[PDB]
Design a protein around this ligand. Structure first.
Ligand code: HEM
Ligand SMILES: CNCCc1cc(F)c(F)c(-c2cc(C)cc(N)n2)c1
Ligand SMILES: C[C@H](O)[C@H](O)[C@H]1CNc2nc(N)[nH]c(=O)c2N1
Ligand SMILES: [Zn+2]
Length: 409
């Protein structure tokens, strides 16, 4: 029953939820892995404990723990794991599972919204064309004319392992990356291997900067197939600044919809290898990481120039200065277009408030400080001063290998 303190407000919360934690962290009594980025076929023996554990908490959630329906659904799933060495979630259990996978995502600062999640059941999907259609409806719904809405589309669960449904894209909407004949990079350098894979599968690249990549969709473990998201469904925000009119000349833009498509959704021991989920952006994801990472668009160089800054001396903080302007611009541009976005101040404040709610009516809130604290201005946001216990609850979103390494073509 551990205590977590906030050192800006002196507020203490007692965490008991970590007792329900099952998985492991990577840390031991003698080493802390809290800054390691990635911390690391299922049988029927292992499957019923996970099913039972999940069904227990689901039925405890609808205020019917131990009722007759709980007992029968338990025996129903036990018997289905006998006959088929797997089982199928009810629609309701799927929606519960998915919302709590988000709820339990310790690295997500946006979880105050976790109960407002739109779950699209795509478990009847059979082909990549079907996936494409399901993803298009996801994009359109989640974008909602810029009034973004949280959503997840859940494709058939893994069965044997060689019939996985996979979205090969790391996110549904990402810009292309092209290495250049002079060794530099165009577009997004993070996607240069993926952009070449699309080209190997036949993508005709408009070798420019902000080229929306096509979907690479693998259905039932079959080879994956290319589809272009109808561009009218890809909402983009041209980035302008409220003071610097030359900022439009940068010609920057970003897409409104952050939609992670490479993670694995675990519910009651069932594994959903394709489960694209989307919300809305926190400003810093674009302004700081996408734009100013050295291995991403890396625009601190150009933006500092146009600001009339001292780029000779490291200690002039020209980088810090141009980083703020960039993030004022990302926010202003999204807001002026009525496209949902949250600033790292409002997002972190809501997460503290979210944390307070979880400690009250749930006994805790697993949280990964290394990821919750924004990548600029860390200590002028309240999460910097908030001790956080990280632990792995299930249902959960898990990392999984990139499919081009595991697939058998
Ligand atoms: C609703 C608005 C949301 C906001 C503002 C938000 C914010 C964020 C941010 C800033 C990150 C860190 C991303 C990065 O640094 O790369 C993150 C990570 C994450 N988000 Fe949220 N998110 C939202 C919605 C969602 C939804 C709907 C889901 C799932 C149903 C989700 C699940 C996750 C997960 C699992 C991670 C961790 C990814 C990883 O470990 O690589 N989020 N979120
Ligand atoms: C494989 N791990 C990916 C981590 C990641 C990368 C990324 F580029 C994102 F945009 C989001 C992300 C996701 C959601 C749902 C909301 C939000 N604000 N960000 C998360
Ligand atoms: C080394 C470190 O774990 C790695 O750079 C992490 C740090 N914290 C992060 N935090 C968020 N939100 N997103 C990230 O990609 C990372 N990267
Ligand atoms: Zn640790």
């Amino acid at each position: 029953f551990l205590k977590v303190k906030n050192w800006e407000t002196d507020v203490v919360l007692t965490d008991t939820l970590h007792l329900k934690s099952t998985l492991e962290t990577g840390c031991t009594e003698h080493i802390c892995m809290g800054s390691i980025m990635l911390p690391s076929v299922a049988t029927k023996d292992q499957l019923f404990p996970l099913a039972k554990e999940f069904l227990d908490q689901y039925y405890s959630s609808i205020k019917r723990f131990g009722s007759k329906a709980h007992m029968d659904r338990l025996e129903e799933v036990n018997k289905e794991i006998e006959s088929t060495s797997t089982y199928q979630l009810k629609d309701t259990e799927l929606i519960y599972g998915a919302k709590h996978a988000w709820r339990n995502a310790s690295r997500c600062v946006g979880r105050i919204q976790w109960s407002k999640l739109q779950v699209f059941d795509a478990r009847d999907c059979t082909t990549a064309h079907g996936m494409f259609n399901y993803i298009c409806n996801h994009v359109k719904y989640a974008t909602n004319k810029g009034n973004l809405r949280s959503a997840i589309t859940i494709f058939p669960q893994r069965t044997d392992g060689k019939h996985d449904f996979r979205v090969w894209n790391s996110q549904l909407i990402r810009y292309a990356g092209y290495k250049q004949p002079d060794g530099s990079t165009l577009g997004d350098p993070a996607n240069v291997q993926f952009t070449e894979i699309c080209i190997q599968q036949g993508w005709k690249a408009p070798r420019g900067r902000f080229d929306v990549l096509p979907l690479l969709l693998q259905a039932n473990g079959n080879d994956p197939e290319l589809f272009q998201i109808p561009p009218e469904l890809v909402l983009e925000v041209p980035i302008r600044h409220p003071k610097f009119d030359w900022f439009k000349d940068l010609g920057l833009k970003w897409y409104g919809l952050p939609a992670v498509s490479n993670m694995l959704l675990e519910i009651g021991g069932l594994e959903f290898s394709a489960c694209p989920f989307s919300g809305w952006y926190m400003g810093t994801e674009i302004g700081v990481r996408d734009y100013c990472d050295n291995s991403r668009y890396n625009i601190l160089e150009e933006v500092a120039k146009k600001m009339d800054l001292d780029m000779r001396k490291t200690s002039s903080l020209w980088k810090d200065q141009a980083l703020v302007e960039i993030n004022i611009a990302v926010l202003y541009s999204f807001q002026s277009d009525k496209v949902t976005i949250v600033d790292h101040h409002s997002a972190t404040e809501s997460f503290i408030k979210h944390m307070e709610n979880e400690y009250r009516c749930r006994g805790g809130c697993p949280a990964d400080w290394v990821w919750i604290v924004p990548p600029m201005s860390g200590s002028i946001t309240p999460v910097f001063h908030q001790e956080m216990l990280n632990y792995r609850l299930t249902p959960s979103f898990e990392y999984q290998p990139d499919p081009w390494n595991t697939h058998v073509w």
